[PDB]
Design a protein around this ligand. Structure first.
Ligand SMILES: O=C1NCCc2[nH]c(-c3ccnc(-c4ccccc4F)c3)cc21
Length: 271
């Protein structure tokens, strides 16, 4: 499966960065095709081998960034693994919402959450917990209206009912920000004034402090706000405007969510 000849035989590399994982992400081009792709460089290790394994197994599933190829090469005198993936040129979910003016509606947020749920559903049914679902890892395939949302980065993935409930918590957090533009770290007025009863009820079941009480993915996907996302109200949301206004605090919000997820993966935690 993993190619053992030089990646640069098949791809022309850039110095240009597209992202940063727990391996950094480079733009590259396929030599035979010209196609723009993305390269993640991982230094070989148990953790790197597991990321490769889990992403490969997930690759091809609904709303997951596809792996095109894996190389095992020498670089700077070290063994490394290069993951080639489709180029997610639309970038980050919430950066795309921010750039809309254009009405962003509750029905639209419901389709995005359903998109993410279908990814989690696929993962959980193959007994993979992702464990780091967050803004940096939710990407669009292109900049056009028909771009597809996909999940990436299997660096914290694990193949526990507990581990799976950390993905469910992520889903609640992502849904919360999507409907209002700010994180849960109450449904305050006026941002939340006109939001679905159904949407607020689903968030509460996801953000349950007790992990054993959180909704499962099967239960998420069966919720009317997900299952019947196409008949959710088209009510104009504050999200894009708030994201725009709060843009100077966005890095802080990401850091907090990252910190929160890492806390959830510790073997032993404070009370
Ligand atoms: O594994 C990861 N962790 C953190 C951040 C991260 N990002 C990627 C990634 C993958 C594919 N494509 C892109 C991309 C392409 C063009 C423009 C903008 C983009 F985000 C980015 C993968 C990872």
């Amino acid at each position: 499966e993993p190619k053992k000849y030089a990646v640069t035989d098949d791809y022309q590399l850039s110095k240009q960065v597209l992202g940063l994982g727990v391996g950094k992400v480079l733009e590259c081009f396929h030599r035979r095709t010209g196609q723009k792709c993305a390269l993640k460089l991982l230094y070989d290790s148990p953790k790197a081998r597991q990321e490769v394994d889990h992403h490969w197994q997930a690759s091809g599933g609904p709303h997951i960034v596809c792996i095109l190829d894996v190389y095992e090469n020498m670089h700077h005198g070290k063994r490394c693994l290069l993951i080639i993936m489709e180029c997610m040129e639309g970038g980050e979910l919430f950066s795309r919402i921010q750039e809309r003016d254009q009405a962003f509606t509750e029905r639209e947020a419901a389709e995005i959450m359903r998109d993410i749920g279908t990814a989690i559903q696929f993962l959980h049914s193959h007994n993979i917990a992702h464990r780091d679902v967050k803004p940096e890892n939710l990407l669009y395939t292109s900049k056009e209206k028909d771009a597809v949302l996909k999940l990436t980065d299997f660096g914290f993935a694990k193949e526990e009912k507990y581990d799976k409930s950390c993905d469910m918590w992520s889903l609640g957090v992502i849904m919360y920000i999507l409907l209002c533009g700010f994180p849960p770290f109450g449904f305050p007025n006026p941002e939340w004034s006109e939001v679905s009863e159904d949407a607020k009820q689903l968030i509460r079941l996801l953000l349950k402090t007790d992990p054993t009480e959180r909704l499962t993915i099967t239960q998420f996907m069966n919720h009317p706000w997900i299952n019947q996302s196409m008949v959710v109200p088209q009510t104009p949301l504050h999200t894009a405007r708030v994201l725009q206004e709060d843009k100077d605090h966005w890095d802080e919000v990401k850091e907090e969510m990252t910190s929160a997820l890492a806390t959830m993966r510790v073997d032993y935690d404070q009370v």
